[PDB]
């Protein structure tokens, strides 16, 4: 999407809304959308019901409304993820984006795979504590950006 359409619709102008319609019509092969059917900014878009969308756009209103719902859910979907940096003994760095509620077994197996190393021969530490396969970032209290140290087992 254009640079403006990347921010939340509450910040959309009249022109952002009209450009959003043109982007959606081409992205989704919709019937041509008359720009004059949403003469309002993004703040006003958020007050319309789905029936209002269907009334204004009988061919595409429900699609545009559901598209808007998905855009509205993006910051909360982002808040479910954190950035983790895995530091090797050789000071190498591999970066991960993981869901706060996903078991860290997935991260440990992925790192061992990229290192060509057996699955259970490395140990992963977070603030001095061994990270178990059934640990989650939320349960460990890892910050939105946090660090993990990895060492090979003896």
Curated annotation (Swiss-Prot):
<feature type="cross-link" description="Glycyl lysine isopeptide (Lys-Gly) (interchain with G-Cter in SUMO1)">
    <location>
        <position position="85"/>
    </location>
</feature>
<dbReference type="GO" id="GO:0099524">
    <property type="term" value="C:postsynaptic cytosol"/>
</dbReference>
<dbReference type="GO" id="GO:0003723">
    <property type="term" value="F:RNA binding"/>
</dbReference>
<dbReference type="GO" id="GO:0019899">
    <property type="term" value="F:enzyme binding"/>
</dbReference>
<feature type="cross-link" description="Glycyl lysine isopeptide (Lys-Gly) (interchain with G-Cter in SUMO2)">
    <location>
        <position position="83"/>
    </location>
</feature>
<dbReference type="GO" id="GO:0005730">
    <property type="term" value="C:nucleolus"/>
</dbReference>
<comment type="subunit">
    <text>Covalently attached to KCNB1; UBE2I increases cross-linking with KCNB1 and PIAS1 decreases cross-links with KCNB1. Interacts with SAE2, RANBP2, PIAS1 and PIAS2. Interacts with PRKN. Covalently attached to a number of proteins such as IKFZ1, PML, RANGAP1, HIPK2, SP100, p53, p73-alpha, MDM2, JUN, DNMT3B and TDG. Also interacts with HIF1A, HIPK2, HIPK3, CHD3, EXOSC9, RAD51 and RAD52. Interacts with USP25 (via ts SIM domain); the interaction weakly sumoylates USP25. Interacts with SIMC1, CASP8AP2, RNF111 and SOBP (via SIM domains). Interacts with BHLHE40/DEC1. Interacts with RWDD3.</text>
</comment>
<feature type="cross-link" description="Glycyl lysine isopeptide (Lys-Gly) (interchain with G-Cter in SUMO2)">
    <location>
        <position position="97"/>
    </location>
</feature>
<feature type="domain" description="Ubiquitin-like">
    <location>
        <begin position="80"/>
        <end position="154"/>
    </location>
</feature>
<keyword id="KW-0597">Phosphoprotein</keyword>
<keyword id="KW-0160">Chromosomal rearrangement</keyword>
<dbReference type="GO" id="GO:0006281">
    <property type="term" value="P:DNA repair"/>
</dbReference>
<dbReference type="GO" id="GO:0034605">
    <property type="term" value="P:cellular response to heat"/>
</dbReference>
<keyword id="KW-0833">Ubl conjugation pathway</keyword>
<dbReference type="GO" id="GO:0010621">
    <property type="term" value="P:negative regulation of transcription by transcription factor localization"/>
</dbReference>
<dbReference type="GO" id="GO:0031647">
    <property type="term" value="P:regulation of protein stability"/>
</dbReference>
<dbReference type="GO" id="GO:0045892">
    <property type="term" value="P:negative regulation of DNA-templated transcription"/>
</dbReference>
<protein>
    <recommendedName>
        <fullName>Small ubiquitin-related modifier 1</fullName>
    </recommendedName>
</protein>
<dbReference type="GO" id="GO:0031334">
    <property type="term" value="P:positive regulation of protein-containing complex assembly"/>
</dbReference>
<dbReference type="GO" id="GO:0008134">
    <property type="term" value="F:transcription factor binding"/>
</dbReference>
<feature type="cross-link" description="Glycyl lysine isopeptide (Lys-Gly) (interchain with G-Cter in SUMO2)">
    <location>
        <position position="105"/>
    </location>
</feature>
<feature type="modified residue" description="Phosphoserine">
    <location>
        <position position="92"/>
    </location>
</feature>
<dbReference type="GO" id="GO:0060021">
    <property type="term" value="P:roof of mouth development"/>
</dbReference>
<dbReference type="GO" id="GO:0005654">
    <property type="term" value="C:nucleoplasm"/>
</dbReference>
<dbReference type="GO" id="GO:0005634">
    <property type="term" value="C:nucleus"/>
</dbReference>
<dbReference type="GO" id="GO:0042308">
    <property type="term" value="P:negative regulation of protein import into nucleus"/>
</dbReference>
<dbReference type="GO" id="GO:0045759">
    <property type="term" value="P:negative regulation of action potential"/>
</dbReference>
<comment type="function">
    <text>Ubiquitin-like protein that can be covalently attached to proteins as a monomer or a lysine-linked polymer. Covalent attachment via an isopeptide bond to its substrates requires prior activation by the E1 complex SAE1-SAE2 and linkage to the E2 enzyme UBE2I, and can be promoted by E3 ligases such as PIAS1-4, RANBP2 or CBX4. This post-translational modification on lysine residues of proteins plays a crucial role in a number of cellular processes such as nuclear transport, DNA replication and repair, mitosis and signal transduction.</text>
</comment>
<feature type="cross-link" description="Glycyl lysine isopeptide (Lys-Gly) (interchain with G-Cter in SUMO2)">
    <location>
        <position position="99"/>
    </location>
</feature>
<dbReference type="GO" id="GO:0032436">
    <property type="term" value="P:positive regulation of proteasomal ubiquitin-dependent protein catabolic process"/>
</dbReference>
<keyword id="KW-0945">Host-virus interaction</keyword>
<dbReference type="GO" id="GO:0071276">
    <property type="term" value="P:cellular response to cadmium ion"/>
</dbReference>
<dbReference type="GO" id="GO:0005829">
    <property type="term" value="C:cytosol"/>
</dbReference>
<dbReference type="GO" id="GO:0015459">
    <property type="term" value="F:potassium channel regulator activity"/>
</dbReference>
<comment type="subunit">
    <text>(Microbial infection) Interacts with Epstein-barr virus BGLF4.</text>
</comment>
<feature type="region of interest" description="(Microbial infection) Interaction with Tula hantavirus">
    <location>
        <begin position="78"/>
        <end position="85"/>
    </location>
</feature>
<dbReference type="GO" id="GO:0090204">
    <property type="term" value="P:protein localization to nuclear pore"/>
</dbReference>
<dbReference type="GO" id="GO:0031965">
    <property type="term" value="C:nuclear membrane"/>
</dbReference>
<dbReference type="GO" id="GO:0030578">
    <property type="term" value="P:PML body organization"/>
</dbReference>
<dbReference type="GO" id="GO:0050821">
    <property type="term" value="P:protein stabilization"/>
</dbReference>
<dbReference type="GO" id="GO:0044389">
    <property type="term" value="F:ubiquitin-like protein ligase binding"/>
</dbReference>
<keyword id="KW-0963">Cytoplasm</keyword>
């Amino acid at each position: 999407l254009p640079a403006h359409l990347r921010l939340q619709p509450i910040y959309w102008s009249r022109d952002d809304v009209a450009q959003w319609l043109k982007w959606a019509e081409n992205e989704f092969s919709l019937r041509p959308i008359d720009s004059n059917t949403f003469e309002m900014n993004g703040k006003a878009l958020l007050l319309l019901t789905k029936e209002d969308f269907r009334y204004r756009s009988p061919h595409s209103g429900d699609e545009l409304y559901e598209l808007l719902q998905h855009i509205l859910a993006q910051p909360a979907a982002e808040g479910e993820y954190i950035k983790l940096k895995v530091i090797g003994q050789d000071s190498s760095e591999i970066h991960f984006k993981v869901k706060m509620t996903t078991h860290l077994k997935k991260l440990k197996e992925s790192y061992c795979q990229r290192q060509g190393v057996p699955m259970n021969s490395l140990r992963f530490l977070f603030e001095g504590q061994r990270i178990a396969d059934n640990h989650t970032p939320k349960e460990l209290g890892m910050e939105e950006e946090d660090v993990i140290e990895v060492y090979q087992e003896q």
